[PDB]
């Protein structure tokens, strides 16, 4: 309910702190570093800029890309995908360190990952974005929202919805401390289709929602009702993913020579 110091409170805070540390350990680029790069606050880095086909080549030569001949849209698609199978592995490692999670029935852990992965992906993508573009290649390129919209018929409508969300999301001015708990909340969602044993899911979750409420009270005097704007964000996301999956249907049946990565096909499998 209320505004007295909870006798659970230090746990909550110990929990917040536990997750904040695993978060930085599983997520090599945080929001702090990412805002730094887009602030020209740190100098070491300055990302190369990709604003047109001309600078595409230029940068595709000054950045060591771990995919990469085939056509541009595809090359870019290929790389969103690789970063994507990478974020799966990083999300799995982090999940595994939320207290309670590894003693869940493994059948169910698989379900909770399958449905949360893309939701998380989308919120981590917001950290890397302004209304102009996305940091790519572990902060080594800046790719332009407009250049992305410039690609051919299927392909240049795949990032827009994620930019659409990022602008709305970033307006909550959340930080890595808020995000590490959000993410464990998302993952731990008892509404998932196919969960065999949900009670212990719901339990861990209440606790994370407590942790989150508390965190947002301490960290954010500025907004009276952020906790709820965030609860609302969790819903928008499932609708954004549905759109993502549906689109990806088109592409699958518009491009021979495709092959989606086997990990990604798995998640995509029987998904809503």
């Amino acid at each position: 309910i209320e505004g007295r110091l909870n006798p659970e409170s230090a746990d909550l805070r110990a929990l917040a702190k536990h997750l904040y540390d695993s978060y930085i350990k599983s997520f090599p680029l945080t929001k702090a570093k990412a805002r730094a790069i887009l602030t020209g606050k740190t100098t070491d880095k300055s990302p190369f800029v990709i604003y047109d086909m001309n600078s595409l080549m230029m940068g595709e030569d000054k950045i060591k890309f771990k995919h990469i001949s085939k056509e541009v849209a595809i090359r870019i698609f290929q790389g969103c995908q690789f970063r994507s199978v990478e974020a799966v592995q990083e999300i799995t490692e982090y999940a595994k360190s939320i207290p309670g999670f590894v003693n869940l029935d493994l059948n169910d852990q698989v379900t909770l990952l399958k449905y949360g992965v893309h939701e998380i992906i989308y919120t981590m993508l917001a950290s890397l974005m302004n209304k102009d573009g996305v940091l790519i290649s572990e902060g080594q390129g800046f790719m332009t929202r407009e250049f992305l919209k410039s690609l051919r018929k299927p392909f240049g409508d795949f990032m827009e919805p994620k930019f659409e969300f990022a602008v709305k999301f970033n307006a909550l001015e959340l930080d890595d401390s808020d995000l590490a708990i959000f993410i464990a909340v998302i993952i731990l969602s008892g509404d998932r289709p196919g969960l065999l044993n949900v009670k212990p899911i719901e339990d861990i979750q209440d606790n994370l929602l407590q942790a989150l409420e508390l965190q947002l009270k301490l960290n954010h005097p500025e907004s009276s009702q952020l906790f709820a704007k965030l609860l609302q964000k969790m819903t928008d996301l499932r609708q954004i993913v549905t759109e993502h999956v549906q689109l990806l249907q088109v592409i699958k049946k518009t491009e021979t020579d495709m092959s989606l990565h086997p990990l990604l096909q798995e998640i995509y499998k029987d998904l809503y």
Binding site: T92, V110, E266, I267
Partner: peptide
Amino acid sequence: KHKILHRLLQ
């Protein structure tokens, strides 16, 4: 089955 996600959870 989801073989890969399974294998990831070790």
